[PDB]
Amino acid sequence: KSLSESTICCFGDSTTWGDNGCGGGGNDISWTSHLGALLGGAVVENFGIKGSRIAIKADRTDSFVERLDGIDDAADVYVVFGGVNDFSRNVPLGELGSTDAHEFYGAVDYLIRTITARSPQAKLVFMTPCKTSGKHEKDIPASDELNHLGLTQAAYVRAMLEVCDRYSVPVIDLYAQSGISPFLPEHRELYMPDGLHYSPAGYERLAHRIAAGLTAVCR
């Protein structure tokens, strides 16, 4: 049950699938492709889907809530990394205690309960969604801008942290500490070409930060 002997299921959005900014790239450039070796030989599975919100919304059918039952249930560690699309595509926040999987609070609650039900011995770690400088041609706000509900990304991050706290879930706070900033021009150029996704070099750098984070909370 050490990390080097573990199978790690990475459940995420474009930033797990490996989008390089243009809808291209893919799993072979994602941080998931680097992580196993950084952890001494873990087997890493990529369950990232572009465009996916944590919460259900009527305009799509591929939310994390909807996808969960179809991902591997037999892994040793689950790493859940999402929420930037909930912010950018106006998922209602709700309140702590929600069980509506159309609200962000309720969707995070559903994921933790349901991962635990289907994978009762696995470790579960959430990673807060990374910042973005926005992609307005796709109507995606920057992290510090308001979405159409009048919320910033920080409200979604706080909600995730509060639900994780309820269930004592370890968190790697990539929102606050990924070490790659889309607000810095050199990091846009090298690591985050569209201010939201990652280049191959950006995903390699992110993999190192994620490895350190996982080692810090799992043994």
Side-chain angles (χ1 to χ4, degrees), residues 142-182:
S143 292
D144 56 349
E145 294 183 306
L146 300 176
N147 72 6
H148 297 157
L149 304 180
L151 298 171
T152 71
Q153 189 171 333
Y156 292 79
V157 176
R158 279 196 309 275
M160 178 177 287
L161 295 175
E162 289 174 2
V163 183
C164 284
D165 169 77
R166 163 73 170 182
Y167 297 112
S168 306
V169 175
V171 175
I172 303 167
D173 193 351
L174 295 180
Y175 176 77
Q177 296 198 16
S178 69
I180 308 179
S181 181

PDB file of all heavy atoms in Angstrom, residues 142-182:
ATOM      1  N   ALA A 142     -11.308  34.683 -16.149  1.00  0.00           N
ATOM      2  CA  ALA A 142     -10.129  34.480 -15.316  1.00  0.00           C
ATOM      3  C   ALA A 142     -10.553  34.208 -13.874  1.00  0.00           C
ATOM      4  O   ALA A 142     -11.657  34.548 -13.444  1.00  0.00           O
ATOM      5  CB  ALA A 142      -9.260  35.734 -15.324  1.00  0.00           C
ATOM      6  N   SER A 143      -9.630  33.646 -13.092  1.00  0.00           N
ATOM      7  CA  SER A 143      -9.999  33.174 -11.753  1.00  0.00           C
ATOM      8  C   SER A 143     -10.517  34.286 -10.878  1.00  0.00           C
ATOM      9  O   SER A 143     -11.353  34.038  -9.970  1.00  0.00           O
ATOM     10  CB  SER A 143      -8.752  32.572 -11.093  1.00  0.00           C
ATOM     11  OG  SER A 143      -8.380  31.384 -11.751  1.00  0.00           O
ATOM     12  N   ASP A 144      -9.994  35.506 -11.085  1.00  0.00           N
ATOM     13  CA  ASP A 144     -10.382  36.631 -10.253  1.00  0.00           C
ATOM     14  C   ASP A 144     -11.575  37.417 -10.789  1.00  0.00           C
ATOM     15  O   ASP A 144     -12.044  38.335 -10.098  1.00  0.00           O
ATOM     16  CB  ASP A 144      -9.174  37.549 -10.002  1.00  0.00           C
ATOM     17  CG  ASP A 144      -8.486  38.053 -11.295  1.00  0.00           C
ATOM     18  OD1 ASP A 144      -8.747  37.579 -12.424  1.00  0.00           O
ATOM     19  OD2 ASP A 144      -7.640  38.969 -11.169  1.00  0.00           O
ATOM     20  N   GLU A 145     -12.071  37.072 -11.980  1.00  0.00           N
ATOM     21  CA  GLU A 145     -13.265  37.685 -12.548  1.00  0.00           C
ATOM     22  C   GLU A 145     -14.521  36.999 -12.016  1.00  0.00           C
ATOM     23  O   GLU A 145     -14.475  35.888 -11.472  1.00  0.00           O
ATOM     24  CB  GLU A 145     -13.222  37.622 -14.081  1.00  0.00           C
ATOM     25  CG  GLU A 145     -12.118  38.454 -14.666  1.00  0.00           C
ATOM     26  CD  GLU A 145     -12.144  38.428 -16.165  1.00  0.00           C
ATOM     27  OE1 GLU A 145     -12.130  37.342 -16.768  1.00  0.00           O
ATOM     28  OE2 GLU A 145     -12.200  39.539 -16.733  1.00  0.00           O
ATOM     29  N   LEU A 146     -15.674  37.637 -12.213  1.00  0.00           N
ATOM     30  CA  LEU A 146     -16.939  37.038 -11.820  1.00  0.00           C
ATOM     31  C   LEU A 146     -17.503  36.226 -12.967  1.00  0.00           C
ATOM     32  O   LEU A 146     -17.512  36.683 -14.120  1.00  0.00           O
ATOM     33  CB  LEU A 146     -17.960  38.104 -11.457  1.00  0.00           C
ATOM     34  CG  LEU A 146     -17.557  39.021 -10.287  1.00  0.00           C
ATOM     35  CD1 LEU A 146     -18.598  40.112 -10.081  1.00  0.00           C
ATOM     36  CD2 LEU A 146     -17.302  38.247  -8.995  1.00  0.00           C
ATOM     37  N   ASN A 147     -18.003  35.039 -12.651  1.00  0.00           N
ATOM     38  CA  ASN A 147     -18.800  34.296 -13.617  1.00  0.00           C
ATOM     39  C   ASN A 147     -20.181  34.941 -13.740  1.00  0.00           C
ATOM     40  O   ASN A 147     -20.455  35.997 -13.159  1.00  0.00           O
ATOM     41  CB  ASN A 147     -18.804  32.795 -13.288  1.00  0.00           C
ATOM     42  CG  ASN A 147     -19.626  32.427 -12.052  1.00  0.00           C
ATOM     43  OD1 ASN A 147     -20.325  33.258 -11.448  1.00  0.00           O
ATOM     44  ND2 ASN A 147     -19.531  31.159 -11.657  1.00  0.00           N
ATOM     45  N   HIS A 148     -21.064  34.317 -14.522  1.00  0.00           N
ATOM     46  CA  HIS A 148     -22.386  34.917 -14.730  1.00  0.00           C
ATOM     47  C   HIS A 148     -23.279  34.810 -13.491  1.00  0.00           C
ATOM     48  O   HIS A 148     -24.348  35.433 -13.446  1.00  0.00           O
ATOM     49  CB  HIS A 148     -23.048  34.320 -15.987  1.00  0.00           C
ATOM     50  CG  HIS A 148     -22.289  34.608 -17.257  1.00  0.00           C
ATOM     51  ND1 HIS A 148     -22.387  33.841 -18.403  1.00  0.00           N
ATOM     52  CD2 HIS A 148     -21.375  35.570 -17.531  1.00  0.00           C
ATOM     53  CE1 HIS A 148     -21.583  34.336 -19.330  1.00  0.00           C
ATOM     54  NE2 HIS A 148     -20.978  35.399 -18.833  1.00  0.00           N
ATOM     55  N   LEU A 149     -22.868  34.041 -12.488  1.00  0.00           N
ATOM     56  CA  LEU A 149     -23.574  33.995 -11.211  1.00  0.00           C
ATOM     57  C   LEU A 149     -23.026  34.996 -10.203  1.00  0.00           C
ATOM     58  O   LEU A 149     -23.487  35.023  -9.051  1.00  0.00           O
ATOM     59  CB  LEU A 149     -23.493  32.581 -10.608  1.00  0.00           C
ATOM     60  CG  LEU A 149     -24.011  31.469 -11.523  1.00  0.00           C
ATOM     61  CD1 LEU A 149     -23.895  30.138 -10.831  1.00  0.00           C
ATOM     62  CD2 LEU A 149     -25.453  31.715 -11.933  1.00  0.00           C
ATOM     63  N   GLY A 150     -22.032  35.790 -10.575  1.00  0.00           N
ATOM     64  CA  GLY A 150     -21.486  36.755  -9.635  1.00  0.00           C
ATOM     65  C   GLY A 150     -20.487  36.167  -8.656  1.00  0.00           C
ATOM     66  O   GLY A 150     -20.213  36.789  -7.618  1.00  0.00           O
ATOM     67  N   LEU A 151     -19.898  35.026  -8.979  1.00  0.00           N
ATOM     68  CA  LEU A 151     -18.962  34.337  -8.099  1.00  0.00           C
ATOM     69  C   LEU A 151     -17.575  34.318  -8.731  1.00  0.00           C
ATOM     70  O   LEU A 151     -17.436  34.248  -9.948  1.00  0.00           O
ATOM     71  CB  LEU A 151     -19.392  32.879  -7.851  1.00  0.00           C
ATOM     72  CG  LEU A 151     -20.739  32.713  -7.146  1.00  0.00           C
ATOM     73  CD1 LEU A 151     -21.164  31.266  -7.162  1.00  0.00           C
ATOM     74  CD2 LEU A 151     -20.611  33.233  -5.706  1.00  0.00           C
ATOM     75  N   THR A 152     -16.536  34.343  -7.893  1.00  0.00           N
ATOM     76  CA  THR A 152     -15.187  34.083  -8.405  1.00  0.00           C
ATOM     77  C   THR A 152     -14.827  32.610  -8.191  1.00  0.00           C
ATOM     78  O   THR A 152     -15.535  31.836  -7.517  1.00  0.00           O
ATOM     79  CB  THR A 152     -14.107  34.941  -7.739  1.00  0.00           C
ATOM     80  OG1 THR A 152     -13.954  34.455  -6.415  1.00  0.00           O
ATOM     81  CG2 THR A 152     -14.448  36.447  -7.731  1.00  0.00           C
ATOM     82  N   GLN A 153     -13.690  32.206  -8.765  1.00  0.00           N
ATOM     83  CA  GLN A 153     -13.278  30.819  -8.608  1.00  0.00           C
ATOM     84  C   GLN A 153     -13.024  30.469  -7.152  1.00  0.00           C
ATOM     85  O   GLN A 153     -13.202  29.311  -6.751  1.00  0.00           O
ATOM     86  CB  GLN A 153     -12.045  30.581  -9.459  1.00  0.00           C
ATOM     87  CG  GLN A 153     -11.641  29.117  -9.541  1.00  0.00           C
ATOM     88  CD  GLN A 153     -10.532  28.860 -10.557  1.00  0.00           C
ATOM     89  OE1 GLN A 153     -10.400  29.612 -11.519  1.00  0.00           O
ATOM     90  NE2 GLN A 153      -9.765  27.792 -10.386  1.00  0.00           N
ATOM     91  N   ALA A 154     -12.581  31.443  -6.355  1.00  0.00           N
ATOM     92  CA  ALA A 154     -12.311  31.198  -4.943  1.00  0.00           C
ATOM     93  C   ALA A 154     -13.526  30.678  -4.201  1.00  0.00           C
ATOM     94  O   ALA A 154     -13.367  29.902  -3.250  1.00  0.00           O
ATOM     95  CB  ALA A 154     -11.787  32.465  -4.269  1.00  0.00           C
ATOM     96  N   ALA A 155     -14.754  31.084  -4.591  1.00  0.00           N
ATOM     97  CA  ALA A 155     -15.946  30.571  -3.913  1.00  0.00           C
ATOM     98  C   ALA A 155     -16.067  29.065  -4.126  1.00  0.00           C
ATOM     99  O   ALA A 155     -16.514  28.331  -3.227  1.00  0.00           O
ATOM    100  CB  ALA A 155     -17.198  31.291  -4.432  1.00  0.00           C
ATOM    101  N   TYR A 156     -15.768  28.595  -5.352  1.00  0.00           N
ATOM    102  CA  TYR A 156     -15.816  27.168  -5.643  1.00  0.00           C
ATOM    103  C   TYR A 156     -14.708  26.431  -4.886  1.00  0.00           C
ATOM    104  O   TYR A 156     -14.935  25.333  -4.348  1.00  0.00           O
ATOM    105  CB  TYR A 156     -15.724  26.925  -7.163  1.00  0.00           C
ATOM    106  CG  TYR A 156     -16.945  27.417  -7.908  1.00  0.00           C
ATOM    107  CD1 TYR A 156     -17.104  28.786  -8.199  1.00  0.00           C
ATOM    108  CD2 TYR A 156     -17.951  26.535  -8.273  1.00  0.00           C
ATOM    109  CE1 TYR A 156     -18.246  29.241  -8.844  1.00  0.00           C
ATOM    110  CE2 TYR A 156     -19.120  26.986  -8.917  1.00  0.00           C
ATOM    111  CZ  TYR A 156     -19.256  28.350  -9.193  1.00  0.00           C
ATOM    112  OH  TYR A 156     -20.362  28.840  -9.841  1.00  0.00           O
ATOM    113  N   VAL A 157     -13.502  27.000  -4.845  1.00  0.00           N
ATOM    114  CA  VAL A 157     -12.419  26.381  -4.084  1.00  0.00           C
ATOM    115  C   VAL A 157     -12.808  26.241  -2.617  1.00  0.00           C
ATOM    116  O   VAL A 157     -12.615  25.185  -2.004  1.00  0.00           O
ATOM    117  CB  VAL A 157     -11.098  27.157  -4.272  1.00  0.00           C
ATOM    118  CG1 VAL A 157     -10.021  26.577  -3.404  1.00  0.00           C
ATOM    119  CG2 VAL A 157     -10.658  27.121  -5.771  1.00  0.00           C
ATOM    120  N   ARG A 158     -13.362  27.304  -2.026  1.00  0.00           N
ATOM    121  CA  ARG A 158     -13.759  27.246  -0.617  1.00  0.00           C
ATOM    122  C   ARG A 158     -14.797  26.172  -0.411  1.00  0.00           C
ATOM    123  O   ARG A 158     -14.756  25.438   0.585  1.00  0.00           O
ATOM    124  CB  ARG A 158     -14.297  28.613  -0.192  1.00  0.00           C
ATOM    125  CG  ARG A 158     -13.220  29.613   0.156  1.00  0.00           C
ATOM    126  CD  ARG A 158     -13.789  30.822   0.949  1.00  0.00           C
ATOM    127  NE  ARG A 158     -14.949  31.444   0.300  1.00  0.00           N
ATOM    128  CZ  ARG A 158     -14.891  32.372  -0.650  1.00  0.00           C
ATOM    129  NH1 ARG A 158     -13.721  32.829  -1.074  1.00  0.00           N
ATOM    130  NH2 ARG A 158     -16.018  32.846  -1.173  1.00  0.00           N
ATOM    131  N   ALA A 159     -15.768  26.078  -1.323  1.00  0.00           N
ATOM    132  CA  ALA A 159     -16.805  25.045  -1.177  1.00  0.00           C
ATOM    133  C   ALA A 159     -16.165  23.652  -1.177  1.00  0.00           C
ATOM    134  O   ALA A 159     -16.510  22.784  -0.359  1.00  0.00           O
ATOM    135  CB  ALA A 159     -17.814  25.170  -2.311  1.00  0.00           C
ATOM    136  N   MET A 160     -15.241  23.407  -2.115  1.00  0.00           N
ATOM    137  CA  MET A 160     -14.554  22.120  -2.166  1.00  0.00           C
ATOM    138  C   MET A 160     -13.837  21.842  -0.862  1.00  0.00           C
ATOM    139  O   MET A 160     -13.923  20.733  -0.321  1.00  0.00           O
ATOM    140  CB  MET A 160     -13.553  22.124  -3.323  1.00  0.00           C
ATOM    141  CG  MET A 160     -12.755  20.815  -3.424  1.00  0.00           C
ATOM    142  SD  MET A 160     -11.632  20.774  -4.840  1.00  0.00           S
ATOM    143  CE  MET A 160     -12.784  20.561  -6.168  1.00  0.00           C
ATOM    144  N   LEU A 161     -13.115  22.840  -0.341  1.00  0.00           N
ATOM    145  CA  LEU A 161     -12.396  22.639   0.915  1.00  0.00           C
ATOM    146  C   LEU A 161     -13.347  22.323   2.069  1.00  0.00           C
ATOM    147  O   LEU A 161     -13.018  21.514   2.957  1.00  0.00           O
ATOM    148  CB  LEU A 161     -11.526  23.860   1.249  1.00  0.00           C
ATOM    149  CG  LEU A 161     -10.384  24.106   0.257  1.00  0.00           C
ATOM    150  CD1 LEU A 161      -9.663  25.385   0.590  1.00  0.00           C
ATOM    151  CD2 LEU A 161      -9.407  22.969   0.221  1.00  0.00           C
ATOM    152  N   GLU A 162     -14.513  22.974   2.113  1.00  0.00           N
ATOM    153  CA  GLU A 162     -15.455  22.732   3.210  1.00  0.00           C
ATOM    154  C   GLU A 162     -16.041  21.321   3.137  1.00  0.00           C
ATOM    155  O   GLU A 162     -16.212  20.665   4.177  1.00  0.00           O
ATOM    156  CB  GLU A 162     -16.549  23.784   3.186  1.00  0.00           C
ATOM    157  CG  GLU A 162     -16.023  25.161   3.605  1.00  0.00           C
ATOM    158  CD  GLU A 162     -17.045  26.259   3.459  1.00  0.00           C
ATOM    159  OE1 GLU A 162     -18.200  25.983   3.073  1.00  0.00           O
ATOM    160  OE2 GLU A 162     -16.698  27.427   3.753  1.00  0.00           O
ATOM    161  N   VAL A 163     -16.380  20.835   1.926  1.00  0.00           N
ATOM    162  CA  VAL A 163     -16.915  19.480   1.836  1.00  0.00           C
ATOM    163  C   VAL A 163     -15.811  18.479   2.156  1.00  0.00           C
ATOM    164  O   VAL A 163     -16.033  17.465   2.845  1.00  0.00           O
ATOM    165  CB  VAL A 163     -17.565  19.209   0.467  1.00  0.00           C
ATOM    166  CG1 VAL A 163     -18.165  17.803   0.443  1.00  0.00           C
ATOM    167  CG2 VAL A 163     -18.627  20.240   0.175  1.00  0.00           C
ATOM    168  N   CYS A 164     -14.599  18.709   1.631  1.00  0.00           N
ATOM    169  CA  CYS A 164     -13.497  17.829   1.984  1.00  0.00           C
ATOM    170  C   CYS A 164     -13.292  17.783   3.497  1.00  0.00           C
ATOM    171  O   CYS A 164     -13.066  16.707   4.076  1.00  0.00           O
ATOM    172  CB  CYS A 164     -12.220  18.270   1.254  1.00  0.00           C
ATOM    173  SG  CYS A 164     -12.229  17.787  -0.501  1.00  0.00           S
ATOM    174  N   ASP A 165     -13.359  18.942   4.160  1.00  0.00           N
ATOM    175  CA  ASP A 165     -13.220  18.952   5.615  1.00  0.00           C
ATOM    176  C   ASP A 165     -14.280  18.076   6.284  1.00  0.00           C
ATOM    177  O   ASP A 165     -13.968  17.319   7.213  1.00  0.00           O
ATOM    178  CB  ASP A 165     -13.304  20.376   6.163  1.00  0.00           C
ATOM    179  CG  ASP A 165     -13.434  20.350   7.689  1.00  0.00           C
ATOM    180  OD1 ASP A 165     -12.435  20.130   8.389  1.00  0.00           O
ATOM    181  OD2 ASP A 165     -14.590  20.456   8.188  1.00  0.00           O
ATOM    182  N   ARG A 166     -15.531  18.165   5.832  1.00  0.00           N
ATOM    183  CA  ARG A 166     -16.593  17.357   6.428  1.00  0.00           C
ATOM    184  C   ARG A 166     -16.183  15.902   6.495  1.00  0.00           C
ATOM    185  O   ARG A 166     -16.455  15.225   7.501  1.00  0.00           O
ATOM    186  CB  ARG A 166     -17.888  17.523   5.635  1.00  0.00           C
ATOM    187  CG  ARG A 166     -18.939  16.462   5.881  1.00  0.00           C
ATOM    188  CD  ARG A 166     -19.615  16.540   7.164  1.00  0.00           C
ATOM    189  NE  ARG A 166     -20.760  15.616   7.149  1.00  0.00           N
ATOM    190  CZ  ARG A 166     -21.568  15.510   8.177  1.00  0.00           C
ATOM    191  NH1 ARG A 166     -21.292  16.261   9.229  1.00  0.00           N
ATOM    192  NH2 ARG A 166     -22.612  14.658   8.176  1.00  0.00           N
ATOM    193  N   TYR A 167     -15.578  15.395   5.414  1.00  0.00           N
ATOM    194  CA  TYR A 167     -15.239  13.985   5.284  1.00  0.00           C
ATOM    195  C   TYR A 167     -13.768  13.700   5.552  1.00  0.00           C
ATOM    196  O   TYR A 167     -13.286  12.612   5.221  1.00  0.00           O
ATOM    197  CB  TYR A 167     -15.660  13.476   3.903  1.00  0.00           C
ATOM    198  CG  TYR A 167     -17.161  13.571   3.718  1.00  0.00           C
ATOM    199  CD1 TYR A 167     -17.718  14.473   2.807  1.00  0.00           C
ATOM    200  CD2 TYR A 167     -18.031  12.743   4.448  1.00  0.00           C
ATOM    201  CE1 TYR A 167     -19.099  14.550   2.624  1.00  0.00           C
ATOM    202  CE2 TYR A 167     -19.398  12.810   4.255  1.00  0.00           C
ATOM    203  CZ  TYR A 167     -19.934  13.720   3.346  1.00  0.00           C
ATOM    204  OH  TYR A 167     -21.296  13.770   3.209  1.00  0.00           O
ATOM    205  N   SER A 168     -13.052  14.656   6.151  1.00  0.00           N
ATOM    206  CA  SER A 168     -11.653  14.471   6.521  1.00  0.00           C
ATOM    207  C   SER A 168     -10.757  14.110   5.321  1.00  0.00           C
ATOM    208  O   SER A 168      -9.761  13.385   5.473  1.00  0.00           O
ATOM    209  CB  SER A 168     -11.508  13.428   7.645  1.00  0.00           C
ATOM    210  OG  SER A 168     -12.342  13.814   8.734  1.00  0.00           O
ATOM    211  N   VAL A 169     -11.062  14.645   4.137  1.00  0.00           N
ATOM    212  CA  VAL A 169     -10.349  14.267   2.913  1.00  0.00           C
ATOM    213  C   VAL A 169      -9.077  15.087   2.707  1.00  0.00           C
ATOM    214  O   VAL A 169      -9.154  16.315   2.641  1.00  0.00           O
ATOM    215  CB  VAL A 169     -11.254  14.410   1.683  1.00  0.00           C
ATOM    216  CG1 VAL A 169     -10.509  14.154   0.391  1.00  0.00           C
ATOM    217  CG2 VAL A 169     -12.424  13.443   1.778  1.00  0.00           C
ATOM    218  N   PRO A 170      -7.906  14.466   2.535  1.00  0.00           N
ATOM    219  CA  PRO A 170      -6.696  15.235   2.215  1.00  0.00           C
ATOM    220  C   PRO A 170      -6.839  16.020   0.914  1.00  0.00           C
ATOM    221  O   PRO A 170      -7.453  15.552  -0.057  1.00  0.00           O
ATOM    222  CB  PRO A 170      -5.631  14.142   2.105  1.00  0.00           C
ATOM    223  CG  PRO A 170      -6.150  13.002   2.920  1.00  0.00           C
ATOM    224  CD  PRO A 170      -7.625  13.017   2.679  1.00  0.00           C
ATOM    225  N   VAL A 171      -6.226  17.212   0.899  1.00  0.00           N
ATOM    226  CA  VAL A 171      -6.290  18.118  -0.249  1.00  0.00           C
ATOM    227  C   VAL A 171      -4.882  18.551  -0.635  1.00  0.00           C
ATOM    228  O   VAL A 171      -4.080  18.909   0.234  1.00  0.00           O
ATOM    229  CB  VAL A 171      -7.155  19.360   0.072  1.00  0.00           C
ATOM    230  CG1 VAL A 171      -7.116  20.363  -1.065  1.00  0.00           C
ATOM    231  CG2 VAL A 171      -8.594  18.948   0.360  1.00  0.00           C
ATOM    232  N   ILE A 172      -4.596  18.556  -1.935  1.00  0.00           N
ATOM    233  CA  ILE A 172      -3.417  19.231  -2.490  1.00  0.00           C
ATOM    234  C   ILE A 172      -3.918  20.518  -3.133  1.00  0.00           C
ATOM    235  O   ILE A 172      -4.703  20.474  -4.088  1.00  0.00           O
ATOM    236  CB  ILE A 172      -2.695  18.348  -3.528  1.00  0.00           C
ATOM    237  CG1 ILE A 172      -2.282  17.008  -2.914  1.00  0.00           C
ATOM    238  CG2 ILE A 172      -1.497  19.123  -4.130  1.00  0.00           C
ATOM    239  CD1 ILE A 172      -1.857  15.961  -3.910  1.00  0.00           C
ATOM    240  N   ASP A 173      -3.502  21.665  -2.590  1.00  0.00           N
ATOM    241  CA  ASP A 173      -4.115  22.940  -2.985  1.00  0.00           C
ATOM    242  C   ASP A 173      -3.354  23.519  -4.178  1.00  0.00           C
ATOM    243  O   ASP A 173      -2.543  24.454  -4.049  1.00  0.00           O
ATOM    244  CB  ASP A 173      -4.166  23.898  -1.800  1.00  0.00           C
ATOM    245  CG  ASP A 173      -5.064  25.094  -2.058  1.00  0.00           C
ATOM    246  OD1 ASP A 173      -5.530  25.317  -3.203  1.00  0.00           O
ATOM    247  OD2 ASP A 173      -5.274  25.855  -1.090  1.00  0.00           O
ATOM    248  N   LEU A 174      -3.614  22.947  -5.367  1.00  0.00           N
ATOM    249  CA  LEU A 174      -3.005  23.446  -6.604  1.00  0.00           C
ATOM    250  C   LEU A 174      -3.526  24.825  -6.993  1.00  0.00           C
ATOM    251  O   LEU A 174      -2.769  25.609  -7.604  1.00  0.00           O
ATOM    252  CB  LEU A 174      -3.234  22.473  -7.767  1.00  0.00           C
ATOM    253  CG  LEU A 174      -2.559  21.107  -7.617  1.00  0.00           C
ATOM    254  CD1 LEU A 174      -2.884  20.254  -8.857  1.00  0.00           C
ATOM    255  CD2 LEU A 174      -1.043  21.208  -7.377  1.00  0.00           C
ATOM    256  N   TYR A 175      -4.774  25.143  -6.634  1.00  0.00           N
ATOM    257  CA  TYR A 175      -5.262  26.510  -6.818  1.00  0.00           C
ATOM    258  C   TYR A 175      -4.281  27.518  -6.236  1.00  0.00           C
ATOM    259  O   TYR A 175      -3.928  28.516  -6.882  1.00  0.00           O
ATOM    260  CB  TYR A 175      -6.631  26.642  -6.156  1.00  0.00           C
ATOM    261  CG  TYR A 175      -7.188  28.049  -6.203  1.00  0.00           C
ATOM    262  CD1 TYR A 175      -7.760  28.587  -7.364  1.00  0.00           C
ATOM    263  CD2 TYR A 175      -7.166  28.855  -5.048  1.00  0.00           C
ATOM    264  CE1 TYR A 175      -8.308  29.876  -7.363  1.00  0.00           C
ATOM    265  CE2 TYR A 175      -7.718  30.125  -5.040  1.00  0.00           C
ATOM    266  CZ  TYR A 175      -8.272  30.651  -6.200  1.00  0.00           C
ATOM    267  OH  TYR A 175      -8.773  31.933  -6.220  1.00  0.00           O
ATOM    268  N   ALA A 176      -3.861  27.274  -4.983  1.00  0.00           N
ATOM    269  CA  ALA A 176      -2.985  28.213  -4.290  1.00  0.00           C
ATOM    270  C   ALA A 176      -1.508  27.978  -4.563  1.00  0.00           C
ATOM    271  O   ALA A 176      -0.725  28.930  -4.426  1.00  0.00           O
ATOM    272  CB  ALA A 176      -3.232  28.099  -2.779  1.00  0.00           C
ATOM    273  N   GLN A 177      -1.085  26.740  -4.909  1.00  0.00           N
ATOM    274  CA  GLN A 177       0.342  26.405  -4.820  1.00  0.00           C
ATOM    275  C   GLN A 177       0.853  25.528  -5.957  1.00  0.00           C
ATOM    276  O   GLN A 177       1.865  24.841  -5.793  1.00  0.00           O
ATOM    277  CB  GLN A 177       0.662  25.726  -3.501  1.00  0.00           C
ATOM    278  CG  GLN A 177       0.432  26.621  -2.294  1.00  0.00           C
ATOM    279  CD  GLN A 177       1.135  26.124  -1.055  1.00  0.00           C
ATOM    280  OE1 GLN A 177       2.033  25.284  -1.126  1.00  0.00           O
ATOM    281  NE2 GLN A 177       0.693  26.601   0.099  1.00  0.00           N
ATOM    282  N   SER A 178       0.238  25.567  -7.135  1.00  0.00           N
ATOM    283  CA  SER A 178       0.762  24.720  -8.214  1.00  0.00           C
ATOM    284  C   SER A 178       2.169  25.094  -8.663  1.00  0.00           C
ATOM    285  O   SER A 178       2.866  24.253  -9.265  1.00  0.00           O
ATOM    286  CB  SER A 178      -0.133  24.784  -9.429  1.00  0.00           C
ATOM    287  OG  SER A 178      -0.040  26.075  -9.995  1.00  0.00           O
ATOM    288  N   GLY A 179       2.564  26.354  -8.460  1.00  0.00           N
ATOM    289  CA  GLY A 179       3.849  26.845  -8.912  1.00  0.00           C
ATOM    290  C   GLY A 179       3.897  27.191 -10.383  1.00  0.00           C
ATOM    291  O   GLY A 179       4.998  27.402 -10.921  1.00  0.00           O
ATOM    292  N   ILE A 180       2.758  27.285 -11.052  1.00  0.00           N
ATOM    293  CA  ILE A 180       2.700  27.728 -12.443  1.00  0.00           C
ATOM    294  C   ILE A 180       1.608  28.774 -12.518  1.00  0.00           C
ATOM    295  O   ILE A 180       0.452  28.461 -12.224  1.00  0.00           O
ATOM    296  CB  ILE A 180       2.368  26.579 -13.406  1.00  0.00           C
ATOM    297  CG1 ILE A 180       3.306  25.389 -13.175  1.00  0.00           C
ATOM    298  CG2 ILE A 180       2.446  27.104 -14.845  1.00  0.00           C
ATOM    299  CD1 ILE A 180       3.028  24.188 -14.096  1.00  0.00           C
ATOM    300  N   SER A 181       1.964  30.023 -12.873  1.00  0.00           N
ATOM    301  CA  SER A 181       0.950  31.086 -12.861  1.00  0.00           C
ATOM    302  C   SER A 181       0.597  31.545 -14.254  1.00  0.00           C
ATOM    303  O   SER A 181       1.462  32.076 -14.965  1.00  0.00           O
ATOM    304  CB  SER A 181       1.401  32.303 -12.067  1.00  0.00           C
ATOM    305  OG  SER A 181       0.356  33.276 -12.093  1.00  0.00           O
ATOM    306  N   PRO A 182      -0.672  31.478 -14.656  1.00  0.00           N
ATOM    307  CA  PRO A 182      -1.050  32.052 -15.952  1.00  0.00           C
ATOM    308  C   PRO A 182      -0.999  33.570 -15.944  1.00  0.00           C
ATOM    309  O   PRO A 182      -1.115  34.158 -17.024  1.00  0.00           O
ATOM    310  CB  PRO A 182      -2.464  31.511 -16.162  1.00  0.00           C
ATOM    311  CG  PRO A 182      -3.001  31.366 -14.711  1.00  0.00           C
ATOM    312  CD  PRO A 182      -1.818  30.894 -13.915  1.00  0.00           C
TER     313      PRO A 182
END
